[PDB]
Design an enzyme around this catalytic site. Structure first.
Site, PDB file in Angstrom:
ATOM      1  N   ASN A  12     -65.719 -76.493  51.416  1.00 42.50           N
ATOM      2  CA  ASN A  12     -66.511 -76.799  52.602  1.00 42.50           C
ATOM      3  C   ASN A  12     -65.676 -77.766  53.425  1.00 42.50           C
ATOM      4  OD1 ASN A  12     -68.650 -75.141  51.863  1.00 42.50           O
ATOM      5  ND2 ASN A  12     -69.832 -76.814  50.929  1.00 42.50           N
ATOM      6  N   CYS A  74     -79.391 -83.356  52.861  1.00 45.94           N
ATOM      7  CA  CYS A  74     -79.438 -84.574  52.056  1.00 45.94           C
ATOM      8  C   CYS A  74     -78.061 -84.943  51.511  1.00 45.94           C
ATOM      9  CB  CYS A  74     -80.446 -84.434  50.913  1.00 45.94           C
ATOM     10  SG  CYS A  74     -80.961 -86.046  50.212  1.00 45.94           S
ATOM     11  N   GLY A  75     -77.400 -84.013  50.837  1.00 43.60           N
ATOM     12  CA  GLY A  75     -76.095 -84.304  50.283  1.00 43.60           C
ATOM     13  C   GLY A  75     -74.925 -83.859  51.128  1.00 43.60           C
ATOM     14  N   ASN A  76     -75.172 -83.431  52.364  1.00 41.77           N
ATOM     15  CA  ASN A  76     -74.138 -82.772  53.142  1.00 41.77           C
ATOM     16  C   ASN A  76     -73.006 -83.742  53.485  1.00 41.77           C
ATOM     17  OD1 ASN A  76     -72.865 -80.720  54.358  1.00 41.77           O
ATOM     18  ND2 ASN A  76     -74.369 -80.425  55.993  1.00 41.77           N
ATOM     19  N   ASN A 158     -83.702 -78.356  51.414  1.00 38.66           N
ATOM     20  CA  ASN A 158     -83.610 -76.941  51.760  1.00 38.66           C
ATOM     21  C   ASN A 158     -84.692 -76.140  51.050  1.00 38.66           C
ATOM     22  OD1 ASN A 158     -81.580 -76.830  53.596  1.00 38.66           O
ATOM     23  ND2 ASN A 158     -79.944 -76.452  52.097  1.00 38.66           N
ATOM     24  N   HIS A 160     -85.049 -73.054  48.371  1.00 43.42           N
ATOM     25  CA  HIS A 160     -84.233 -72.287  47.434  1.00 43.42           C
ATOM     26  C   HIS A 160     -85.107 -71.417  46.547  1.00 43.42           C
ATOM     27  CE1 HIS A 160     -80.596 -74.773  48.278  1.00 43.42           C
ATOM     28  NE2 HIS A 160     -81.519 -75.686  48.521  1.00 43.42           N
ATOM     29  N   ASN A 191     -82.653 -69.916  50.447  1.00 44.27           N
ATOM     30  CA  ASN A 191     -81.315 -69.809  49.884  1.00 44.27           C
ATOM     31  C   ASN A 191     -81.405 -69.140  48.521  1.00 44.27           C
ATOM     32  OD1 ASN A 191     -78.901 -71.358  51.358  1.00 44.27           O
ATOM     33  ND2 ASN A 191     -80.857 -72.272  51.937  1.00 44.27           N
ATOM     34  N   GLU A 209     -76.483 -67.863  51.009  1.00 49.17           N
ATOM     35  CA  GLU A 209     -77.012 -68.918  51.869  1.00 49.17           C
ATOM     36  C   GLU A 209     -77.714 -68.347  53.108  1.00 49.17           C
ATOM     37  OE1 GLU A 209     -74.103 -71.959  52.334  1.00 49.17           O
ATOM     38  OE2 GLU A 209     -75.520 -73.385  53.253  1.00 49.17           O
ATOM     39  N   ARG A 210     -78.732 -69.084  53.597  1.00 53.17           N
ATOM     40  CA  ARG A 210     -79.537 -68.703  54.776  1.00 53.17           C
ATOM     41  C   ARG A 210     -78.705 -68.359  56.010  1.00 53.17           C
ATOM     42  NH1 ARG A 210     -84.211 -73.119  55.870  1.00 53.17           N
ATOM     43  NH2 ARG A 210     -82.267 -74.352  55.708  1.00 53.17           N
ATOM     44  N   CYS A 218     -72.526 -74.040  47.436  1.00 54.03           N
ATOM     45  CA  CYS A 218     -73.671 -74.706  48.034  1.00 54.03           C
ATOM     46  C   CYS A 218     -74.100 -75.803  47.079  1.00 54.03           C
ATOM     47  CB  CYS A 218     -74.826 -73.738  48.305  1.00 54.03           C
ATOM     48  SG  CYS A 218     -75.994 -74.330  49.573  1.00 54.03           S
ATOM     49  N   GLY A 219     -73.899 -77.057  47.493  1.00 54.28           N
ATOM     50  CA  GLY A 219     -74.356 -78.222  46.754  1.00 54.28           C
ATOM     51  C   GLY A 219     -75.842 -78.200  46.450  1.00 54.28           C
ATOM     52  N   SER A 220     -76.702 -78.198  47.480  1.00 49.82           N
ATOM     53  CA  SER A 220     -78.132 -78.101  47.217  1.00 49.82           C
ATOM     54  C   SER A 220     -78.440 -76.864  46.390  1.00 49.82           C
ATOM     55  CB  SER A 220     -78.929 -78.048  48.512  1.00 49.82           C
ATOM     56  OG  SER A 220     -78.418 -77.036  49.357  1.00 49.82           O
ATOM     57  N   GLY A 221     -77.651 -75.799  46.552  1.00 47.49           N
ATOM     58  CA  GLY A 221     -77.845 -74.622  45.724  1.00 47.49           C
ATOM     59  C   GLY A 221     -77.681 -74.918  44.244  1.00 47.49           C
TER      60      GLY A 221
END
Ligand SMILES: [Cl-]
Ligand SMILES: [Cl-]
Ligand SMILES: [Cl-]
Ligand SMILES: [Cl-]
Ligand SMILES: [Cl-]
Ligand SMILES: [Cl-]
Lengths: 275, 158, 275, 158
Positions: A12, A74-76, A158, A160, A191, A209-210, A218-221
Site C-alpha cells: 500500500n 482507523c488503521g490507515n 469498515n 466486512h 469487504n 475490497e469495496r 487489507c489491514g482492516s480485512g
C-alpha cells in the site's frame, strides 16, 4: 517547493509529506495530478504529517486518496507515519500519541522495526456494519445465486464479511467476491474476505475490497478475519495472518478488549518536486 | 534602533526540559500564546538581552538555566500591513530574531510569571515539541518552523 | 547511493539516471524491483545516460524495460534524454549527437522546449516488417472474421498496420486490434493504428500496441500512420497528430528522406534512492 | 615525498578550447590515453608544478594558456594491489591530485608532443567533453568523474 517520501506498507504505497517543517498547500486537482502513476509521483494515498492540535499529543495526520478526498480509516497509513517521523528525525519516541480524522491513538515501534497499531474493539452488532439481519449471530447464511455461503460479519469501522475456505488458492474470488459485495444485505456494500485456517495461530487470507476488487493487503480485512475467526472458536488470541503481500500479527483478547495489529512499513525513496 | 530594511533586533527563547517539552506562555490580558521574545537595547550582546528578558518575564537568573544552542543567523519576519505604523519613522516593518534554547536545570517553581509591575504574560504550561508551530499567530509561523527544526535534534538528546 | 529523475513523454514515464557523473550498477532483478509501481519508483522504462563511446559524439544511452531487458527502439526515450542532459547541465547544446543500441543520431531542441527526433526513413518492403504479401502495395486486404479491412503496412523499425477510420471515438479498438495483431500475415505480430484524417495536415490516432493493448501514445505509431497516410495521398508533408495523451508533429518528405518526429518531454520530479 | 597515508602529490591538467572540447593524449609507446598529470617536487607550489609539466610534456609557456579554475581540494585514488610496490618504502599506495583547467588562447600548433628527450606522450587529439570518463583506466575513473563534473559548468561558458 516540496520534499516528500515514497513509502509502502505491504504494497500500500503512500506519498508522505512533512507539513511540520514545511509550508505546503493542496487541491483535489493537485492531489489527482500527483497521484497519477505515469504523469506524477504515483501513489494510492497521500499522507500529510502535521503538528499536534493539542499540547498532550505528538502529531496529527491526514490522508487523501487519489480521487482527492480525505480518508478516515482507523488503521490507515499508521505504520508508514510511525516509521516516517522517526526516520526524518521529528521524534525519537517509540510510543507516539497521534490524532486523526478518527480521534486520538497510540502507536508503538518494536525492536524489529515493526509498528503495532491499536485498531479499537471490533463491533459485531449488525445495525453498525450495516448488515441486515434479525439478531447478532456468530454466523449467517448468504443465499448467493445457486450457492449457500456461511459468512461472519464484523465492523472494524469498515464493513466486512468473512468466509471460511479450504485453500485460498482454490477459492473463486474474482467471481464470488463481486456478487457478495453488492449483496442485498449490504446496503453500504462490504469487504469480502476469504480465510483459510492453518492452525489456531496461523491463517491465510485474500480480500475482495469495496469498489476496488482483490487487493494484496487489507489491514482492516486481516483484523476482521481474525476477529470473526476468534469469535467462532477457530483461532487463538495471537494469530499470524498471511496476505498476498506479506505478514501481519493480530492480537485480540475478545470482547471488552481492543485489537492490536502489527506490520512492517517500508521506506522506498526520498523525492523533491516543484508544485 | 531599526536597521536599513525596517527590521528591529529581537531575541527568542525556547525553554525545554529533559522530558522533551517546551514552555508555552499566555500573553498578558488576552488568551493568545507564544514564546518569549525581547528587544536588544543599544550596546547589548545577543546573549545579554536574552538573559535580560529571561529574568524580566520569567524571573530566572543564569544559575537556573543551561544554554544549549542558539541559531546560526538572524531570522526575519514581516508584520502584515494592517499592523504597520507607517507614520512613526523610521517605520518598523518586521523583526530580525536570534533564538536561544535553554534547559531548565532548576525546578518548575522559580517560573515567576510576573516579577515586574509590567507583566507581559499571565500564566504558562508545558507543551509537546511541535505544538507552537500550529498555535502561534500565522505570520510568526515560518520563523517558528525553522527554529524548532534547527533545535529539534539537540532537544532529542534524552 | 543513486540520484534519478522521473520524467514522461506524452504519458510514457521513464526513470532517468545520470551514469556520467555517477557510479551505478544494475540487475534484471534490481530493475524489476525498481520498476514496480507500489514497491519501487514506478516506471515503464529505465533510461541510462552514459559518456560517449567515441570522441565525436556527445553521449550514449541505454534503455531497459520493466521486465529487465534492454530495448532497442529508434525513437524510444529520445526526447526525455534530450531535455534531461540540458536540465542537469551536462551539456548546453541544442543539437546533440547520441549513440544507442540502434546507432548514431542527432537531436534538436527547439525554442518551444520540444525535441525533434530523426527516426530514419520508413521501410515499406513487406519482407522487412515482416508482412506476408506478394508485392509491396499501398493498401492491402485483411480478411478478419466477417469484416474486410483496408490496411497499410510500414516498418519504423517496429511492425505497423495502419487503418483508416471515420471517428476514432467510434472505432472498436478493443475488439478488432487483438484480432489484427495476432493475424496470420503478421508472424512477428504488429502494432495496430486507427487513423482518422481531419485535414491534409491534421489527423487523430489510436494505437493497439503489441502484446500490451491500447496505449495513450506510440511514437513509432504516429510515425507509421503519417507515413502510410502520405504514401496513400491522404496527407501533406507536415502533419499534426493528436494522440490520447497529447500532440506530435511529424514531417516527412517522401521516399529518399528521413522522417522527423517532434514532441514534448516533461520533467516530473528529482529523487534519491539507496540501492 | 609521500604523506602519511601513502598518497603522493600530483597535478592534473585539462586543456579545452572555445568549442568545448578537451585535449586527449596518447601515452608513450602504448596506445592507451589519459590526461597530463605530474609530480610536485619539494618546495613546489601547486600552480608551479602545474606549469612545469605543462611545459615539459606540452611545450606551453604561460603566454599560451589562460587559467580557468582549479579544484577546491585534493582528490585521492588508490592503485590496485597488483601494481603496488610493497618493498620500496615508504610504499606509495595511490595519488592525491589537484586539477587545473586551462583555455588554449594560442593555436593548436605550439602543442609540442615531445620537447624533452623523455617524451611521456606520442600524439594527441581533440575529444568531446565526457569522453575521457569512459576511456581512462578503470581505477582512475572516479577522479575523472568528479573532475569533469566540477569543471563542466565553467566550460559551458561559450
Ligand atoms: Cl492518546
Ligand atoms: Cl489507548
Ligand atoms: Cl515589532
Ligand atoms: Cl551523428
Ligand atoms: Cl543524421
Ligand atoms: Cl603513482
Amino acid at each position: 517547493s516540496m520534499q516528500f517520501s515514497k513509502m509502502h506498507g505491504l504494497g500500500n504505497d503512500f506519498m508522505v509529506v512533512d507539513a511540520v517543517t514545511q509550508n505546503v498547500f493542496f487541491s483535489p486537482e493537485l492531489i489527482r495530478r500527483l497521484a497519477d502513476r505515469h504523469l506524477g509521483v504515483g501513489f494510492d494515498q497521500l499522507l500529510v504529517v502535521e503538528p499536534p492540535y493539542d499540547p498532550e499529543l505528538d502529531f496529527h495526520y491526514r490522508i487523501f486518496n487519489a480521487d482527492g478526498s480525505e480518508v478516515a480509516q482507523c488503521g490507515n497509513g499508521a505504520r508508514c507515519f510511525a516509521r516516517f517521523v522517526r526516520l526524518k528525525g521529528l521524534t525519537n519516541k517509540r510510543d507516539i500519541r497521534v490524532s486523526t480524522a478518527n480521534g486520538r491513538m497510540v502507536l508503538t515501534v518494536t525492536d524489529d522495526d515493526l509498528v503495532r497499531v491499536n485498531m479499537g474493539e471490533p463491533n459485531f452488532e449488525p445495525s453498525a456494519v450495516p448488515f441486515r439481519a434479525n439478531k447478532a449471530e456468530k454466523t449467517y447464511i448468504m443465499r448467493a445465486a445457486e450457492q449457500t455461503i456461511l459468512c461472519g460479519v464484523v465492523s472494524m469501522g469498515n464493513p466486512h464479511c468473512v468466509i471460511q475456505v479450504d485453500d485460498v488458492d482454490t477459492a473463486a474470488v474474482e467471481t464470488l467476491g463481486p456478487v457478495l459485495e453488492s449483496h442485498e444485505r449490504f446496503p453500504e456494500r462490504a469487504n469480502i474476505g476469504f480465510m483459510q485456517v492453518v492452525k489456531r495461530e496461523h491463517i491465510r487470507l485474500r480480500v475482495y475490497e469495496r469498489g476496488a476488487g482483490e487487493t494484496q493487503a487489507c489491514g482492516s480485512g486481516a483484523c476482521a478475519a481474525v476477529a470473526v475467526g476468534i469469535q467462532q472458536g477457530l483461532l487463538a488470541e495471537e494469530v499470524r495472518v498471511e496476505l498476498p503481500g506479506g505478514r501481519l500479527d493480530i492480537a485480540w483478547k475478545g470482547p471488552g478488549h481492543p485489537l492490536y495489529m502489527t506490520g512492517p512499513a517500508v521506506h522506498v525513496y526520498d523525492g523533491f518536486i516543484h508544485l | 534602533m531599526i536597521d536599513d530594511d525596517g527590521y528591529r533586533p529581537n531575541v527568542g527563547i525556547v525553554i525545554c526540559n529533559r522530558q522533551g517539552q517546551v514552555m508555552w506562555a499566555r500573553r498578558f490580558g488576552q488568551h493568545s500564546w507564544q514564546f518569549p521574545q525581547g528587544g536588544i537595547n543599544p550596546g547589548e550582546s545577543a546573549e545579554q538581552a536574552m538573559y535580560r528578558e529571561l529574568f524580566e518575564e520569567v524571573g530566572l537568573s543564569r544559575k537556573d538555566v543551561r544554554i544549549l544552542a542558539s541559531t546560526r543567523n538572524w531570522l526575519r519576519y514581516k508584520l502584515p500591513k494592517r499592523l504597520v505604523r507607517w507614520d512613526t519613522k523610521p517605520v518598523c516593518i518586521g523583526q530580525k530574531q536570534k533564538w536561544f534554547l535553554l534547559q531548565l536545570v532548576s525546578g518548575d517553581a522559580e517560573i515567576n510569571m510576573q516579577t515586574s509591575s509590567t507583566p507581559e504574560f499571565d500564566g504558562w504550561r508545558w507543551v509537546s515539541y511541535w505544538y507552537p508551530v500550529r498555535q502561534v499567530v500565522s505570520f510568526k509561523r515560518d520563523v517558528y518552523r525553522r527554529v524548532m527544526k534547527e533545535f529539534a535534534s539537540v532537544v532529542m538528546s534524552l
